[PDB]
Amino acid sequence: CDLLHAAPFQNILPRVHVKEGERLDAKMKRLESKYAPLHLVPLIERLGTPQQIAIAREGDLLTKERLCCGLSMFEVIL
């Protein structure tokens, strides 16, 4: 649930519907331009101070890296 709310600020888009004469490759990149202003890290790297940038990279890393992404515990417990 934390990751679902982070997606918009981390350039993560869901699959879009495709009509006729439409290519997801040519559409997903268009959608990515719509939510370009929301992509946090790039924005801060563009207007932020080195200190702000460093703090943004660290926070962004912590936000995207969760146990559910590829780690589990019950196995180690046993």
């Binding site: 890393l61 912590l62 890296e65 146990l67 992404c69 590829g70 780690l71």
Partner: peptide, 8 residues
């Protein structure tokens, strides 16, 4: 895709 934040 290793997660360094968890010490990996």
């Amino acid at each position: 895709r290793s997660m360094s934040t968890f010490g990996k």
